[PDB]
Amino acid sequence: MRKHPQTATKHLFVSGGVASSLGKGLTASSLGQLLTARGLHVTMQKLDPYLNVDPGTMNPFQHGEVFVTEDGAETDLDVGHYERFLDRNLPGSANVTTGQVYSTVIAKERRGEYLGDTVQVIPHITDEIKRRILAMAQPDADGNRPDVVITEIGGTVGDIESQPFLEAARQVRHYLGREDVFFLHVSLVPYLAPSGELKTKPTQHSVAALRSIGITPDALILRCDRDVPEALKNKIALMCDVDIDGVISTPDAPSIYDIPKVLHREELDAFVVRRLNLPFRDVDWTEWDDLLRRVHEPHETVRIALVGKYVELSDAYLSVAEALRAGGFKHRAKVEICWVASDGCETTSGAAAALGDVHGVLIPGGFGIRGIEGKIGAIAYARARGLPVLGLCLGLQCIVIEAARSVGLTNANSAEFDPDTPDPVIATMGGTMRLGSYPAVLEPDSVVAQAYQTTQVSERHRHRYEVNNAYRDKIAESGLRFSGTSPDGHLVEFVEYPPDRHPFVVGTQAHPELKSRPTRPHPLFVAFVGAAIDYKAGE
Amino acid sequence: MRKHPQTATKHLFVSGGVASSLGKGLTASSLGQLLTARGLHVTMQKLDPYLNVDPGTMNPFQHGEVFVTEDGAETDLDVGHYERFLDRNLPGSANVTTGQVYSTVIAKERRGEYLGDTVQVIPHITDEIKRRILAMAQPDADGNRPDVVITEIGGTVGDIESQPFLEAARQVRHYLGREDVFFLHVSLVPYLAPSGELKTKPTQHSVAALRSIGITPDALILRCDRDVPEALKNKIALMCDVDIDGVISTPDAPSIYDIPKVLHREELDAFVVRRLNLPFRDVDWTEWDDLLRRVHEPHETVRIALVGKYVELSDAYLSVAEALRAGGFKHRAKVEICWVASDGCETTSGAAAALGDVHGVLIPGGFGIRGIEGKIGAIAYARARGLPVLGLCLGLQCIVIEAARSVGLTNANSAEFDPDTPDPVIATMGGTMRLGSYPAVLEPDSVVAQAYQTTQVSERHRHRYEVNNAYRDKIAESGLRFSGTSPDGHLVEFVEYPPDRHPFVVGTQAHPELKSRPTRPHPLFVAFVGAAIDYKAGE
Amino acid sequence: MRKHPQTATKHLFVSGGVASSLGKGLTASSLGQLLTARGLHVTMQKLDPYLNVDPGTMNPFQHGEVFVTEDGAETDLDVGHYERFLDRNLPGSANVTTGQVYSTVIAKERRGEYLGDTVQVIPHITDEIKRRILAMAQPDADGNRPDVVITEIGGTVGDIESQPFLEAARQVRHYLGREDVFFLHVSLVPYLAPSGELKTKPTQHSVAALRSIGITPDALILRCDRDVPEALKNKIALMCDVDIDGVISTPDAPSIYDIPKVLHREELDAFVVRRLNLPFRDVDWTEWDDLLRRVHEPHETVRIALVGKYVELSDAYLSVAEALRAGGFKHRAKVEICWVASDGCETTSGAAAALGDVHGVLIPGGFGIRGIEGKIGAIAYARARGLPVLGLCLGLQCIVIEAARSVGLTNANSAEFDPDTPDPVIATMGGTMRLGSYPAVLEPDSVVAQAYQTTQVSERHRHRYEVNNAYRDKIAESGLRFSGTSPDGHLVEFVEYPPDRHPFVVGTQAHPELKSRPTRPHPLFVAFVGAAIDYKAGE
Ligand SMILES: O=P(O)(O)Oc1cc[n+]([C@@H]2O[C@H](COP(=O)(O)OP(=O)(O)OP(=O)(O)O)[C@@H](O)[C@H]2O)c(O)n1
Ligand SMILES: O=P(O)(O)Oc1cc[n+]([C@@H]2O[C@H](COP(=O)(O)OP(=O)(O)OP(=O)(O)O)[C@@H](O)[C@H]2O)c(O)n1
Ligand SMILES: O=P(O)(O)Oc1cc[n+]([C@@H]2O[C@H](COP(=O)(O)OP(=O)(O)OP(=O)(O)O)[C@@H](O)[C@H]2O)c(O)n1
Ligand SMILES: Nc1ncnc2c1ncn2[C@@H]1O[C@H](COP(=O)(O)OP(=O)(O)O)[C@@H](O)[C@H]1O
Ligand SMILES: Nc1ncnc2c1ncn2[C@@H]1O[C@H](COP(=O)(O)OP(=O)(O)O)[C@@H](O)[C@H]1O
Ligand SMILES: Nc1ncnc2c1ncn2[C@@H]1O[C@H](COP(=O)(O)OP(=O)(O)O)[C@@H](O)[C@H]1O
Ligand SMILES: [Mg+2]
Ligand SMILES: [Mg+2]
Ligand SMILES: [Mg+2]
Ligand SMILES: [Mg+2]
Ligand SMILES: [Mg+2]
Ligand SMILES: [Mg+2]
Numbered sequence A, B, C: 001m002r003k004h005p006q007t008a009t010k011h012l013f014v015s016g017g018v019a020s021s022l023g024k025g026l027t028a029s030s031l032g033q034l035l036t037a038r039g040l041h042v043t044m045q046k047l048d049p050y051l052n053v054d055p056g057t058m059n060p061f062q063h064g065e066v067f068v069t070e071d072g073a074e075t076d077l078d079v080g081h082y083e084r085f086l087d088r089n090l091p092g093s094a095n096v097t098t099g100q101v102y103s104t105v106i107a108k109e110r111r112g113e114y115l116g117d118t119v120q121v122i123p124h125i126t127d128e129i130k131r132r133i134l135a136m137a138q139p140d141a142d143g144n145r146p147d148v149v150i151t152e153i154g155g156t157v158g159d160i161e162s163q164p165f166l167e168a169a170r171q172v173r174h175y176l177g178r179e180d181v182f183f184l185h186v187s188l189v190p191y192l193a194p195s196g197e198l199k200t201k202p203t204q205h206s207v208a209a210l211r212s213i214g215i216t217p218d219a220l221i222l223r224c225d226r227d228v229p230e231a232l233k234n235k236i237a238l239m240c241d242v243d244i245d246g247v248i249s250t251p252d253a254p255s256i257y258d259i260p261k262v263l264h265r266e267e268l269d270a271f272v273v274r275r276l277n278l279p280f281r282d283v284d285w286t287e288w289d290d291l292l293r294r295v296h297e298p299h300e301t302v303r304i305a306l307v308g309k310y311v312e313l314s315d316a317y318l319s320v321a322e323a324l325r326a327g328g329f330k331h332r333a334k335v336e337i338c339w340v341a342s343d344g345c346e347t348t349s350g351a352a353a354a355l356g357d358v359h360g361v362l363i364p365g366g367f368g369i370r371g372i373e374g375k376i377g378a379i380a381y382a383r384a385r386g387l388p389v390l391g392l393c394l395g396l397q398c399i400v401i402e403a404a405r406s407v408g409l410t411n412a413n414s415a416e417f418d419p420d421t422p423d424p425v426i427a428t429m430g431g432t433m434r435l436g437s438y439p440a441v442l443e444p445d446s447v448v449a450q451a452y453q454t455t456q457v458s459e460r461h462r463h464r465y466e467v468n469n470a471y472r473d474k475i476a477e478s479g480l481r482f483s484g485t486s487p488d489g490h491l492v493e494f495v496e497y498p499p500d501r502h503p504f505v506v507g508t509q510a511h512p513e514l515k516s517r518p519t520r521p522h523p524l525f526v527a528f529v530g531a532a533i534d535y536k537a538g539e
Helices: A024-037 A078-086 A098-110 A121-137 A160-176 A201-211 A230-240 A256-265 A268-276 A286-296 A318-331 A348-355 A372-385 A394-407 A447-452 A469-478 A523-538 B024-037 B078-086 B098-110 B121-137 B160-176 B201-211 B230-240 B256-265 B268-276 B286-296 B318-330 B348-355 B372-385 B394-407 B447-452 B469-478 B523-538 C024-037 C078-086 C098-110 C121-137 C160-176 C201-211 C230-240 C256-265 C268-276 C286-296 C318-331 C348-355 C372-385 C394-407 C447-452 C469-476 C523-538
Strands: A010-016 A042-048 A095-097 A148-153 A181-188 A219-224 A247-251 A300-308 A333-341 A361-363 A389-392 A424-428 A434-442 A456-463 A465-467 A481-485 A492-496 A505-508 B010-016 B042-048 B095-097 B148-153 B181-188 B219-224 B247-251 B300-308 B333-341 B361-363 B389-392 B424-428 B434-442 B456-463 B465-467 B481-485 B492-496 B505-508 C010-016 C042-048 C095-097 C148-153 C181-188 C219-224 C247-251 C300-308 C333-341 C361-363 C389-392 C424-428 C434-442 C456-463 C465-467 C481-485 C492-496 C505-508
Touching: A010 A024, A010 A160, A010 A268, A024 A042, A024 A078, A024 A148, A024 A181, A024 A256, A024 A268, A042 A078, A042 A121, A078 A318, A095 A098, A098 A121, A098 A160, A121 A148, A121 A160, A148 A160, A160 A181, A181 A201, A181 A268, A201 A219, A201 A230, A219 A230, A219 A268, A230 A247, A247 A256, A256 A268, A256 A286, A286 A318, A300 A318, A300 A372, A300 A523, A318 A333, A318 A523, A333 A348, A333 A523, A348 A372, A361 A372, A361 A394, A372 A389, A372 A394, A389 A394, A389 A523, A394 A424, A394 A469, A394 A492, A394 A505, A434 A447, A434 A492, A447 A481, A447 A492, A447 A505, A447 A523, A465 A469, A469 A481, A505 A523, B010 B024, B010 B160, B010 B268, B024 B042, B024 B078, B024 B148, B024 B181, B024 B256, B024 B268, B042 B078, B042 B121, B078 B318, B095 B098, B098 B121, B098 B160, B121 B148, B121 B160, B148 B160, B160 B181, B181 B201, B181 B268, B201 B219, B201 B230, B219 B230, B219 B268, B230 B247, B247 B256, B256 B268, B256 B286, B286 B318, B300 B318, B300 B372, B300 B523, B318 B333, B318 B523, B333 B348, B333 B523, B348 B372, B361 B372, B361 B394, B372 B389, B372 B394, B389 B394, B389 B523, B394 B424, B394 B469, B394 B492, B394 B505, B434 B447, B434 B492, B447 B481, B447 B492, B447 B505, B447 B523, B465 B469, B469 B481, B505 B523, C010 C024, C010 C160, C010 C268, C024 C042, C024 C078, C024 C148, C024 C181, C024 C256, C024 C268, C042 C078, C042 C121, C078 C318, C095 C098, C098 C121, C098 C160, C121 C148, C121 C160, C148 C160, C160 C181, C181 C201, C181 C268, C201 C219, C201 C230, C219 C230, C219 C268, C230 C247, C247 C256, C256 C268, C256 C286, C286 C318, C300 C318, C300 C348, C300 C372, C300 C523, C318 C333, C318 C523, C333 C348, C333 C523, C348 C372, C361 C372, C361 C394, C372 C389, C372 C394, C389 C394, C389 C523, C394 C424, C394 C469, C394 C492, C394 C505, C434 C447, C434 C492, C447 C481, C447 C492, C447 C505, C447 C523, C465 C469, C469 C481, C505 C523
Parallel strands: A010 A148, A010 A181, A042 A095, A042 A148, A181 A219, A219 A247, A300 A333, A300 A361, A361 A389, A389 A505, B010 B148, B010 B181, B042 B095, B042 B148, B181 B219, B219 B247, B300 B333, B300 B361, B361 B389, B389 B505, C010 C148, C010 C181, C042 C095, C042 C148, C181 C219, C219 C247, C300 C333, C300 C361, C361 C389, C389 C505
Antiparallel strands: A424 A465, A434 A456, A434 A481, A481 A492, A492 A505, B424 B465, B434 B456, B434 B481, B481 B492, B492 B505, C424 C465, C434 C456, C434 C481, C481 C492, C492 C505
């Protein structure tokens, strides 16, 4: 029955081998999904081996886009998968880093809190990490105690930087015993085309590397481009001393939302539940079956251009692409994304050549970005052509600069992008970096208000430049409306053209893609995809 | 009660760290002693990492003396400790080697028994080793099934040659689970005189090396020259993730027979019994208490010279020294051994300077030996001085050569030591190497028969040269009696002088020290020590 | 080693079948002694099914003598065995009774503490009993937490009164699980002389009765008059579903102090330790071997008369008889007890016929007693004959009455025994019943002080009549000395004659037999037995 006796909090560690980008985080999120559907209170955590105290200092070419929490911490991309699959808001405590651990221990040492002992990597650093892991088990603010804690160990087994985290995980297995701690290992099975064979040796070497630090995997996730033969799974199970139930073939699925089905079909969740002795019930597939219908059987299709610098074959825009697809799901339309380089759109002819075939354009935000002349050029072309545009953060800034160049302000720019501009229509109000959720008020019956169907909203922000209030009355002559603001009205939060000027061209300073979920699409992307559909139908 | 239900055969693996010669084999033998006294049927086994198919090819400077079994196998020194402490005769199967394992697997490959598979170090070699380990568990020829199998892994953790044996032990722990397999780890705690501190770092590194291959020790034997402080044991337990019950301080005992008392006092046997869940009863200390009384509280003392080449600070004569001490124990006399170089006895003045203070001389056997001129010189001096002499193998050969040089045969020698001798009184009957137990018949009322108190005996042999039957009648004029022979009389097995010629001077081709036990002293050494006592008392 | 990790407190329940007086309490005490010698902190408890709130109201024909604790509670006889074998002082909480439990629950009900529930035998009464059982596990006043709690369930399985206690034991086994709770069942194997066969059927029916309430015994103690054959143990093990290791033959030992040896020889303690998974070490038999030497190999012998009413084949004087034998042990003399009826000593000829062969006389205390004319007659005869006398409680009262009748007070008596006496030399100071330990001061160099070798003592008291202070100066003319008193001198605590009047005639109001232990004999009994030995030697 729905009510069960109390049991200790189970720890499930996910680790990676051979390489990064194996979908380790997505596999952990999908397992969290399945365990949630079986009725368990899953909570999740990530451990980042890098020394950056937070990824805000990084460049999106390193590990993709940054993410932001409601308590305002700045965290790795994987916390976004955790949100999108658990449909939850996670604390900043959900992302530990070596930078934070070392800073904490060094500070504690300077204060003498170790009573004159020699501070060492073992026990003190591993103790801090073990403390940070077991803190997840404590009852939440409302007393709800997690049934399973899924911890993802970033990096690769054998990286020098992972050594303290894996030692902490080993000590947790020692303290709590095997009945509470489960190790899931994700590994790569490469295909060599010239000889037409899958090779298990990389997996064997990775499992041996893991054993060399005192960890025995309970299951293996064999990432591959094609379904692994049964003979190879038997060979791997034999060589790696893993139960043949625990070798899980995980081929590249057409979309990330099929992964829960793949793992359920292989009975990974059943294996984990049996091994950890958790109480369970069957998965109610109703919701996710509807989602997968919206994914695989859409009624129509639409093409959207994604314009950026990182677009050169990188997942720097993962949240934006997923929010776009969720918007398509709300309308049961397939959204096809055309990855367009910003710099090909600097010339009007180049912009026409790039964009002429699409049904909409998206200008996402970024940091360390350059060359926004191409972005604004794409805006100018799209407005003339009638394509819908959604601008996120920098997209709104480029929209405002386009409007500035529409009314007389030809040399106008951001102080970020031309410090010598005579018309800094975008300027520092380095100023206060706005981070996290803030409330905003919307113009009644604005296109933004028509989308949200409310006058009050809250959105996650990450930026420090703002619209210069000195130019509102000048740029309003473009027809642009400051249709959403901070509650005091001091800060512009949304801009749009009236529908009769262009059917839909909207920008927002915030990152709404960080509040979207596939089963709860965000209003603005529903609106943007609807406008793109209307363009395609009317064109 | 004495009768208990059936349980699976428990495996206890003993491994070493830091260095060899830590007393790993003696600790295993003492634990076998304690578990036997608690009523369990202990059996024992050794795994030798070296590639020699058997140590017969080695030189006693490498690892000490060789040992011989009743089925006639030639084995490491440690099987001698197993015999002396369990008072048992062990099969040749009790000593596995890498040489045997590789030869077996290669032979099986040549015969195609692996059906075309690639032969690998894993699984095939480790499977052969695991098979050889689990074969010890099978019921004996009488159906007696061992309760515990104690396996000693020779070498050091981290030697390249030990890698297959430790992997086999790990696989045994995997197959049988933790409730059946127990790992005991012996390690060194060095004392640094300049700073006056015991150092635990070598132990930490050894335990880490052991963990790096997938073995977690259940207990630590801390070998030291002085009793380890409690703070250091706590530090070791904390750093090594070992139960504080499992850190066992094992300081250098004055004699090897005190080790069972040291281990019992530390409750190692209790810890092992609890952890393996074995049925037990208290140790009946009656017998071993009597032995230790004979050891520590003797009524008198006697000095015996041990003459050899390996005597330069090496345990090449361990069995001989222990048989001497057992002979002393039968008479409750302390036997003090003066280690005398053979080459200082070549000159009569040098022999007098070396031996003049002793009460008896022992000439042990050997192989690859040279310089027996000094040995025979010691015999000549001792006979003139009246000291008792016992000659083992080569000791008998030197006695016979001395007698040859006593009757006319001044240039007589062994064909081994002067191939050009005109009088090869010792000669090949390379001839048949006699190995193991053979029966012999003794002259009635011979000194040998007076010692054994029987006319028939069996002794372990290891030699290929024999007394040349052509010279019996010539050398008998020395007064020497061929007082023991093979049953057909063809081979001389013992020689002695009549008591009125010298009170006791006896030699035997066999190695009686391989049938002695501390609680069952061998007749000949009882006789030899009694003669030395008589000399000391009469002198 | 001596220091082990923490483990949960183990509960061991001792229950009885077929009949009472099977030595269930003595077996529990012996097991406690063994577990203490193996190094465990044993604590003990008894549950009495009878409704009497304490045994003070009972008659010594029911269950033998009453016992007293230092906090002054009045408890069953078995607490005396627990003291004598553990050599400890136990709280009054060590004796629960149905009277106390029902009174407690009824009182709580009247105060509404059950919040309107229907009060039932299950849960509420069994909950109170389980609470009182688990309270023994709590850390003591110094933080020492017991390792094993041994609980004796009084009565017999299948008595109506035992049903709540056995249900509480079943609930304890449910709560703590089988790894913590062990059931020891004591049962009788009768011998039928006409057919010469031991019968196991009573044991089978008792074990079946026990199983019918949900308890499966882990071991059986087969009480018998002769050693049980092995075939019967096999039959019992098979029929009763008890491990053949757990059927323990426990024949009637010549003295109660052999029982630890019997249980150890049968390996009951080993079985319990293995089954509960307790950490242990071997029993150090030094002390108890010395005790058993004093028991079985005395140098001499002496006969002592025990004069009382309950002497008609009853154990109403167990503590006194054991204290006598402990006194004998201090001197290495065998003490033989001649059980003498008081009423045969009323006439001087009858007293002579009863006592003439003994070497000393003991007058023990009692309650509900009558006919003290015979007791005083034995005192008068013994004093004339010169036999030494020790008088306990009523013995002191009779001594004082004898002295009263020695000086002029022929009609003197206690107000208890002649309410109309004209000379109540013993009188209520019903008055305050003095119970438990009280301090006393002794005359310097008194015979009592010569025994105790001190001027200050404390003794356990149970009485309400006292020496009437009005008669001290009158009765002192007998020669009697009030050689010990309360610190204020108000109360007489010891009386004696000077050695030249009689070599030893002493009485005390207290029960020194309740402070004696077999390994710590009490001064007064050592003195009394020494005086009896001196009489025997001089007579
Ligand atoms: O992705 P997550 O979820 O595991 O989060 C991750 C991924 C990676 N890392 C660390 O960054 C460094 C380089 O990583 P990196 O894999 O990219 O190696 P590289 O030199 O760049 O070779 P390659 O061409 O294969 O990229 C390594 O020290 C990693 O331990 C962290 O801390 N968290
Ligand atoms: O004694 P056991 O019972 O363990 O039986 C033993 C002892 C040693 N071994 C092997 O012989 C080689 C050298 O041994 P070795 O310790 O002597 O090293 P080394 O180079 O000589 O340095 P060191 O000066 O310290 O002697 C090593 O490969 C060992 O694995 C074996 O097979 N059985
Ligand atoms: O003798 P009768 O005249 O009454 O005739 C008897 C005696 C006994 N029985 C039955 O045989 C079984 C074992 O009997 P049994 O008493 O011997 O028990 P057990 O297991 O052997 O224990 P143990 O012998 O030690 O007491 C029982 O089922 C009895 O009901 C019968 O049918 N007739
Ligand atoms: N099983 C899969 N099938 C198809 N695509 C996938 C799968 N797993 C992951 N991906 C994609 O590959 C990328 C790597 O996944 P990711 O979550 O980042 O793992 P990691 O934490 O190691 O970096 C993601 O962008 C994800 O969308
Ligand atoms: N605990 C000890 N105390 C004193 N002497 C010892 C002790 N242990 C071993 N020895 C001696 O040191 C030598 C090494 O012991 P050994 O049995 O050969 O161990 P290993 O198998 O590693 O070679 C032996 O000759 C033994 O007599
Ligand atoms: N195993 C025994 N051998 C000899 N005498 C015994 C034995 N056990 C008990 N007794 C004696 O029998 C009497 C009854 O034993 P007891 O401890 O009181 O059991 P219970 O608690 O049921 O009353 C005791 O006085 C004791 O001295
Ligand atoms: Mg990644
Ligand atoms: Mg990288
Ligand atoms: Mg060695
Ligand atoms: Mg060496
Ligand atoms: Mg009783
Ligand atoms: Mg009764």
